[PDB]
Design a protein around this ligand. Structure first.
Ligand SMILES: [Cl-]
Lengths: 102, 160, 99
């Protein structure tokens, strides 16, 4: 290698998620174990975030900061009424965002 | 009619085997074989065996962190947490080395790999002590700017 | 507002082959039932279009790469079907190399 990232990130497996914002931007509660055909599974999410800005970017031309993007995993979330399966947002990476400066 | 199990019941029946994700509740002896599914996060069976029960999912203890969660058909995997790496002969997690000021990242500190540092070469510096920052290219003050401080391997140049 | 590395995001529900979290080549079932109710398995993917934008060339060499995440899906590992965490591309990021 001898290669480096523009934005540094740290990833960890999260097994105790309790809240998250859905694919509709609506915040919501996330349950633990789920029941899929008489068997119970733990809900696990591999989460990745930033530490910000960017490294190696030509400052003399662009403005930049590090942003954490996200994927969408289907999970069991209690909205208030009943539990339902919906796609939640999960921090998955850190990318540098560019913006023409001056 | 081949006995894909090599195991027989008390009357010549080739014991059935507990497939992937299922363990052996009770060993075939007087009767066939009793298989029950393993528990997600608790037990797994990555083998189609007529003699193997659901084994206990490996747990990450101490400085060990989950790198892979346990499924009913696959054990979990554990690696040394973010700030550490695994020492080869000891198997113990040791805190990553840091590239001190005037020194920079070459190779990241991950799992079995401890941080590989570098004394900053001609033209670069390292402002901090950590294991993520590589040596950076010096700022070149303008012909019109007052070089308040020059670039050394440990501090970048300053201007006005 | 640009992106250092150009990517494309897409919903995938035709996933056939996939690599699992242990690096195992595995097959992914078309649809699945949860309570006598069948859905197709969908996965949100982000890849590169194949060199990064706005990099300080004078000092660094750079290229874009596709990172991955892990998701649980129902797989038919040859014989039987099992739940595993498969690797799926989730973003395109830039890697630097000092010149
Ligand atoms: Cl990036």
């Amino acid at each position: 290698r001898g290669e480096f990232s523009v934005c540094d990130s740290v990833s960890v497996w999260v097994g105790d998620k309790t809240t998250a914002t859905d694919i509709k931007g609506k915040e919501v509660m996330v349950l633990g174990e789920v029941n899929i055909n008489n068997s119970v599974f733990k809900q696990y999410f591999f989460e990745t975030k930033c530490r910000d800005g960017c490294r190696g970017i030509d400052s003399k031309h662009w403005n930049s900061y590090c942003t954490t993007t996200h994927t969408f995993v289907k999970a069991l979330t209690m909205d208030g009424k009943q539990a339902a399966w919906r796609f939640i947002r999960i921090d998955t990476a850190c990318v540098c965002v560019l913006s023409r400066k001056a | 009619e081949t006995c894909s199990t090599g195991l027989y019941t008390h009357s010549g029946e080739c014991c059935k085997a507990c497939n992937l994700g299922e363990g052996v509740a009770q060993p075939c002896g007087a009767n066939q074989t009793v298989c029950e599914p393993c528990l997600d996060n608790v037990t797994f069976s990555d083998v189609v065996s007529a003699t193997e029960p659901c084994k206990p999912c490996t747990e990450c203890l101490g400085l060990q962190s989950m790198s892979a969660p346990c499924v009913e058909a696959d054990d979990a995997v554990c690696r040394c947490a973010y700030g550490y790496y695994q020492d080869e002969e000891t198997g113990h997690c040791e805190a990553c080395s840091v590239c001190e000021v005037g020194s920079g990242l070459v190779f990241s500190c991950q799992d079995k790999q401890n941080t590989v540092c570098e004394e900053c070469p001609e033209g670069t510096y390292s402002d901090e002590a950590n294991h993520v920052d590589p040596c950076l290219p010096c700022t070149v003050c303008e012909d019109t700017e007052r070089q308040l401080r020059e670039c050394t391997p440990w501090a970048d140049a300053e201007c006005e």
